[PDB]
Amino acid sequence: HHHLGNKLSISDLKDIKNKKVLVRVDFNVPIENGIIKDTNRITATLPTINHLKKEGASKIILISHCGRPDGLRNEKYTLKPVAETLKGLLGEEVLFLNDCVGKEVEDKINAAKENSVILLENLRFHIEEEGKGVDANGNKVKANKEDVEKFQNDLTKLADVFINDAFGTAHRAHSSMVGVKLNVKASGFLMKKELEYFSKALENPQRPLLAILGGAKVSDKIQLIKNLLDKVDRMIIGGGMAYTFKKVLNNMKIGTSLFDEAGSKIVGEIMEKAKAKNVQIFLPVDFKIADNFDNNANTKFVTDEEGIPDNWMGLDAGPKSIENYKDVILTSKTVIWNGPQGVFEMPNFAKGSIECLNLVVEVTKKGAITIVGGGDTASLVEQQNKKNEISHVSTGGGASLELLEGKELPGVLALSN
Amino acid sequence: HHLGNKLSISDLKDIKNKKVLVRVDFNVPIENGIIKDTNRITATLPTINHLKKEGASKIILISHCGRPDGLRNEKYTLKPVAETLKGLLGEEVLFLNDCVGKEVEDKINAAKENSVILLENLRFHIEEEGKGVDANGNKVKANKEDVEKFQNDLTKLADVFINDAFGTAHRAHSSMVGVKLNVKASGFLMKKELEYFSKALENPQRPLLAILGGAKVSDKIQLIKNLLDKVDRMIIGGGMAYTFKKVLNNMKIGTSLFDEAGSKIVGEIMEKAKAKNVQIFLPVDFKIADNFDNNANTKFVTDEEGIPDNWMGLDAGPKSIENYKDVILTSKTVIWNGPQGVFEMPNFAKGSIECLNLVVEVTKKGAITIVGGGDTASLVEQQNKKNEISHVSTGGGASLELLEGKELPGVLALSN
Structure with missing residues (x-):
């Protein structure tokens, strides 16, 4: 019953060519007045992103969270700036979308450049990610069971292959952690090293x-x-x-x-x-x-x-x-x-x-x-x-x-x- | 095994004339300053009334509401609870917009004999949870010297401590572990849960x-x-x-x-x-x-x-x-x-x-x-x-x- 070592990693993936890849990353970074204080967490994803490009992945879709917005859109916790930092680190234009799920999101992925990097909006703007949240009044609210399942399916159809590179959240049974029901599910270089x-x-x-x-x-x-x-x-x-x-x-x-x-x-x-x-x-x-x-x-x-x-x-x-x-x-x-x-x-x-x-x-x-x-x-x-x-x-x-x-x-x- | 050996409010023989600090769960649904569900408030009444009937000098209440994460947030003030409390006790209830420091101690001492006092959200201070968040949304750790001080200032509020917030007992927060008084007992809710x-x-x-x-x-x-x-x-x-x-x-x-x-x-x-x-x-x-x-x-x-x-x-x-x-x-x-x-x-x-x-x-x-x-x-x-x-x-x-x-x-x- 050893569940830490026996897990498939990005390193062992052969059939990645032309596939779209959803990657769960940790982008929970400090920020003052729109500028990112520390880049380490963004910087750490680079080996995972780079490897997916080299191996010929069609599109690289990044999902993450920032802080505790508790199921509501909160301006402080937008991860738009992370697409701006990522721009420099990759040497490419990086498409950022105001949402992480839905019709406009699904198309805007399939339209962008082949081999390109897309960063979706903070996952926790949706109550269904954590399964619970808070409303405008400060009162605790629970997500609907059908809504959570739908949200997981919405994320599932975004790509063909799933890469988790966010060990820091692996302890939560959240939608982005357990709900991506793709055939191929593998650890990224950051997750792999942590697991090893x-x-x-x-x-x-x-x-x-x-x-x-x-x-x-x-x-x-x-x-x-x-x-x-x-x-x-x-x-x-x-x-x-x-x-x-x-x-x-x-x-x-x-x-x-x-x-x-x-x-x-x-x-x-x-x-x-x-x-x-x-x-x-x-x-x-x-x-x-x-x-x-x-x-x-x-x-x-x-x-x-x-x-x-x-x-x-x-x-x-x-x-x-x-x-x-x-x-x-x-x-x-x-x-x-x-x-x-x-x-x-x-x-x-x-x-x-x-x-x-x-x-x-x-x-x-x-x-x-x-x-x-x-x-x-x-x-x-x-x-x-x-x-x-x-x-x-x-x-x-x-x-x-x-x-x-x-x-x-x-x-x-x-x-x- | 650690649940069945704990001191409760039932066994306190010398409540009379003592200042009593009570940790309660007042984390309630609210809209436009109007409380939606009073259940958590009415549940504290057997604890409050017993303290009253026994002759406590002051009944100081401390609690939290939601997750203000060390910041003062108007959305999670406890002022409306004191308003509700007035209607349940048939009695004016003092409310202080702080919970520590000399200004607070003096107003408690000044207040009517046998009176109830409700303090403001524990969680406005980063020292309650030990961690918090700033106006930028960045996680901040509380300084260890300040945590110890905040705990001492709560201890200075009263002579006897009563914990009635079972629902928070799983967390090593200052109000759960740092009230270093000699007598620390279950309220009636806590007692029932432990029993x-x-x-x-x-x-x-x-x-x-x-x-x-x-x-x-x-x-x-x-x-x-x-x-x-x-x-x-x-x-x-x-x-x-x-x-x-x-x-x-x-x-x-x-x-x-x-x-x-x-x-x-x-x-x-x-x-x-x-x-x-x-x-x-x-x-x-x-x-x-x-x-x-x-x-x-x-x-x-x-x-x-x-x-x-x-x-x-x-x-x-x-x-x-x-x-x-x-x-x-x-x-x-x-x-x-x-x-x-x-x-x-x-x-x-x-x-x-x-x-x-x-x-x-x-x-x-x-x-x-x-x-x-x-x-x-x-x-x-x-x-x-x-x-x-x-x-x-x-x-x-x-x-x-x-x-x-x-x-x-x-x-x-x-x-x-």
Whole structure:
């Protein structure tokens, strides 16, 4: 029952010549006053688009969403500008249509240049994409069952072949993800790479497999921890999470450290389970503490045996803990990393997370498969400009998290084998 | 197990003279400043009245409405709710267009003794959800220092916290997890939800039946998987069924809904159901139509007589509906989430309706019955049989998470 590896990709398609191809892309980009702040998400689709041209596809039709317009046309979330950026990246005129479905759309595709690129309007302008939405009044509305089916058929007849290149939405069972009922359904280069790497980490992984977890809350991350406990051999738990585990397990004094009241109730069974499932759990054994949540506050180092004084708070793992990472990380053959090890946005408490990155980068050179999912950790990698030193940095946010929680991804399952 | 050990409003001995903060669900339908459905508001009255009768000094209410995503949005103000509240309490109700800071604390302290105060939309502050959106439509993360402050400012509002918004408890938002008061209890709605799901999911009288239905299997997979570890019996209908039947039995299904994603998982589910000794009841016959329209032509077909090409399954047949009787009426706990056909098409609603009649009948026999989802809740509403079921859940979101085997931070954050 391994559904990540066995899926057909664009790379394995032979009969693409003269066919029209519908491609689901992630174009959820930042934008100020009509100009696109970051292009990476647009830029990432290029290999998929380019390959379809080279192989002689008749027409390339791009569908995507922007933000949460909740089933209504909203000016802020028009993806017209993405056709303007795409214009430069391809060196061609790119046809943009005010709709994603219907009569005028169907003809305007078949009329444009052979081998040309068409970008359709935001899919979520239609309630039927998510299956639910909001009306002009702010009230929740559900889409009709016949309308959703029709909308899926409307999308289905736009092309002959379907390419999903949007892993970041594969966790939703939306119309664009599961409703394109074409014979040939394949992952794009972006989706393929995402599937390959998560397949390696989660399905017959090369072991020891290590998960490195951090962040502020435990409660946000119960299902993540519980599920990973079934898969991994080793787990680091750091960041703000550590103080909750330390308070429950050791009755450590934590001063004004972040304490997760909700998550603390789960610490017991997480540990009873780590034992049952043969997982080694590593928690920090010392801490860098600050007298105020500020980069310029007075700081100090304390061991877990010493504990944290009153009104002081732990904001980073201490030197002993950072030293403990070495054997844990450098001796694994697969690493999944989702969560900072301290408040890294502040330079004086960035060291724990930075040295953790250095170690993950070092073991990748040794041969280990290393994955970063999650936004915060990705921000760290981007800041250090070390993206290409990691085996894979996941774009998917909600989806990667949901896959790590053990959920099957509808968008992935709806691909051909 | 974490549902059945929680402190509720019933067990608080010292409410008198205390400032009480209440998290409620006021996420209501509205038009032109006029509230369409007051149900969610009147549901908070037993909580409010108890607090009143017990001698609370102030009753501070906090809630959210829709998804303003950290921006102040006139479309989702809570001012109209205070207007409605006045008519239900027979009493003037203070409304503040903020929810944190000293200006707010002072107006609470200044207000009449034993009075009710409603604060503005929690979700105008990015710190409630931790994430939000700016005037450009770009996703923005909230600063961690500000989140901690916002939580402290809510904690400073009162001496005792009451959570009554079960439907939000699945999210680690500031109002669910960050009210760090010593006494944190269920309101009457939360209590009822916890009592019922606790009974069903922790210590059920058996046979425990799950009734599942919907168009897709793709989104119900964790629902089914988890519920397989819980129940003795499971009915699967309403569209899902056609995917199971085609994959398992090789049954011709014509132009009926087929989940291309779910199909990959159907084999796995039946393996696990068999291995865990969970009996599966799938439709044995079907009501078929030549178009997804109420006015179409219709006939009935069996397991073996497949659905002919260009025909469509829209409801379980008479033999399948008869099969429900033995399954439902001999159960002692029933969890129901999903209609058994396209239920708001009169022709082909029958299966979904008879299933309701059987659930109602078993409740009279002494079973505990829970309706969870949104569409199932609607069916129970249009038939006006809300009072005929043991418990109809508010959540949708929170009830789904609980049925999928996940924990609720809002519940976890309550006292024992």
